[PDB]
Amino acid sequence: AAQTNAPWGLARISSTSPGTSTYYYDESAGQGSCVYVIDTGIEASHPEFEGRAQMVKTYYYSSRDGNGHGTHCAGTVGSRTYGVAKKTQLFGVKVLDDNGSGQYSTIIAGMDFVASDKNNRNCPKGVVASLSLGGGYSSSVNSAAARLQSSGVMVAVAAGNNNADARNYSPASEPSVCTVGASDRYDRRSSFSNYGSVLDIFGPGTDILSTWIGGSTRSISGTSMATPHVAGLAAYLMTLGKTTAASACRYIADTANKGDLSNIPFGTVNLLAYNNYQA
Template structure:
């Protein structure tokens, strides 16, 4: 549809900031995310609220404020009247209802203490399935930092050899009271179960004991990663794991994109609904790297989301890794596939030295084993790139 510019100019109030709606997500009543236009007066001012809506929200309490590159904004409780006032302010890019993000795990099975490497590591280092030996270069991700936005990490687990640290908690609990984050960390960098056995692990706890957290907290965690990573020694680069998700929410995607623009690589879970991942966040953000899950028989897991622009597929069914009680656990989900890829990203950076996020995505896809995965039926699944993550060691 074409618009006459003169006509558009006569209708300034008809073109206010939109209130974006989530497709099916769980929203938090009265809580909103407000994203500002780059370069606006409010985005440059320490007193954001006093410069918005003619001062109508000056006394509103901000739950979080955000500044990641050009991504500026805040989270707050707002009345309907305040929402309308912000929608009419030309400095506001858009508003969204805050919502809930969840871990992307399918099931929890019995805790085990097996010290053998899981099947996923063997698959990651061989072109053919069925090999239990994990082959890897001795650099093993040295000189890299891995950030995990999740339920925290049990840093005292002997598998981490003192390389894990809980940087910040947004839940009031300075421990992994769920286990999911520790499991993810183990697949990335533990001595037995990890892909990159020398990477340093930094956890941001944004999810509670039930594995859930608000989107506003997730965005705050992303900003923490950007700022904290600048204070660490990571000469070969920084990678980020987000094994969480929910219905598509633009502000989360924009925050991830802004962090990628800062030079950080984000691998994210595609989701566990057996659906097209384009309807989910943060998986749908093009600058992130969405990961689907496969099983030990090289089939795309029935729960795994899919899509024509999926980044890569990795082992995500019956994955053995570290747990928050000092033992181990076997669980499944795209949450488990994603840390295989984040570990692989750290592993590649340990070998090559620092490269940008886009180049790292390309390298992971170029190394991948093509055509190995059974994608099952359905046109959308069939269009999913048939690329299984591979570390290149035995090619």
């Protein structure tokens, strides 16, 4: 399948070179997989989700995305026009308030919730979790992400936007989950993207067009935007049977575009998420 005039990020993950405009992908599109978007919520009503998005848990007086961040992230995972895995099931877990903030105790609870709730869901091709969030180093937050991964979920987390070593941020610094840095459309490291040995992979993160609340769209930037590219790619690959939750991060690193990015500091991987689709 091919999507003409796709957002640059989608074209990027189906090409070996930057600058193209078509997203090439296998028509299975992540059908039968599930991605939990652990964020500010999802506007499940948005036409771009086509009925495939639903809230399953909230930690605040409402389950609505009153911010947009989580809807944008969910859109990059699986919306029809802006999403990597266009037939995946999307589940919303609102651990962040409508200012985009949340306590670590709430984020940990949301992660433990997903580890259990996936046993309530029909996800025959496997389960992914996308965490476009983080703060300073916490052993407890890192452990929560490691438990979620251990329970059989492919965990993808943002490296952070501090232009610093992600070793000092959580859950970015957890070794057993997939930590995602951000690149721009010219294959440069995004100016804000964290870096360091704990990163596993880069994804498109600068000027990413996706869904927004109120049934709209917008382009924003962040490692928050790169993480759902990798999460959706994992769900796409698990539907294709090419990997599993336990191995997807390594498989994506195995099959990434290598050495294509500029301004990668010494000791940080030079790997860019890539679907290696051959029509």
